[PDB]
Design a protein around this ligand. Structure first.
Ligand SMILES: Cc1nnc2n1-c1ccc(-c3cnn(C)c3)cc1[C@H](Nc1ccc(Cl)cc1)CC2
Ligand SMILES: Cc1nnc2n1-c1ccc(-c3cnn(C)c3)cc1[C@H](Nc1ccc(Cl)cc1)CC2
Lengths: 107, 108
C-alpha cells in the first residue's frame, strides 16, 4: 500500500541509519548478552530487521499492523531495561522520530 | 488544524471513555499512591486530562506535539512500573488504539 511504502522508504529508512539505531537492527541475542531473564520478561520480541523483512515480503495487510510492531519493539525496551540505562534514552529518541514521521504518512 | 481536530474528536474521544483509561485521566498522584520514587524516575509526567485540556485550549501547534504527549504518557508507565503490573497491560491496550487511530489521521 501507499502507507506501507511510506513506512518502508521514509520512516524505517530514517530510523535505520540513526546513530542510536544499532541495538535495534536485529533481534536481542540474550545468549550473547548473558541476559537469561530477557525472554522470561519479554514474550513478544521485535526489532527493526524483522519489521524490515516483513515490509519487503508483504507480510503486512495494513499500516497500523506495521506501526504496532514498531511500538512493541520500543515498549519491550522500556519494560525490560532499567530507567537509567542508555538504551532507554536511545529508544525514546528513535520513537519520537517514528511518531514525527508517522504524522506525515499519506492517507 | 485538521489533524488536531482528528486527535481531539477521534483519538482522545476513544481513549478517554475506554474502560482502562481511569488511571490515566489525572496526573499520577505519588502521595495518594504511596510512590515516593515516582518523580525521581519519571521526569516528564503526562496524562490524558492534561492532553485533553491542551486540545480544548488550542495549546498545540502541530499534531506531532500532541502525539508526543500521548507517547510520553505511555512510556512513563512502561519505564516506572514492573513488567507484571496490570497497569502495563492497560497502557498497552490504550496505546494500540492510539496507534490504530493515528494510522488514519489526515495528512497535513
Ligand atoms: C534494544 C534492547 N532492549 N533491551 C535490550 N536491548 C539490546 C539489543 C542489542 C544489544 C547489543 C550489544 N551489542 N550488540 C552488537 C548489540 C544490547 C541491548 C541491551 N544492552 C545494551 C544496549 C546499548 C548499550 Cl550502549 C549497552 C548495553 C540489553 C537488552
Ligand atoms: C498510569 C500510571 N503509571 N504509573 C502509575 N500509574 C497509576 C495512575 C493512577 C492510579 C490510581 C489508583 N487509584 N486511583 C484512583 C488512581 C494507579 C497507578 C499505578 N498503580 C495501579 C494501577 C492500576 C491498578 Cl488496577 C492498581 C494499581 C502506579 C502508578
Amino acid at each position: 500500500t501507499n502507507q506501507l511504502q511510506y513506512l518502508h522508504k521514509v520512516v524505517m529508512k530514517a530510523l535505520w541509519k540513526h546513530q542510536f539505531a544499532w541495538p535495534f537492527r536485529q533481534p536481542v541475542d540474550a545468549v550473547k548478552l548473558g541476559l537469561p531473564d530477557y525472554h522470561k520478561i519479554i514474550k513478544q520480541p521485535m526489532d527493526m530487521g524483522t519489521i524490515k523483512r516483513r515490509l519487503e515480503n508483504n507480510y503486512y495487510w495494513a499500516a497500523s499492523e506495521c506501526m504496532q510492531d514498531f511500538n512493541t519493539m520500543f515498549t519491550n525496551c522500556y519494560i525490560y531495561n532499567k530507567p537509567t540505562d542508555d538504551i532507554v534514552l536511545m529508544a525514546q529518541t528513535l520513537e519520537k522520530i517514528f511518531l514525527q514521521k508517522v504524522a506525515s504518512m499519506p492517507q
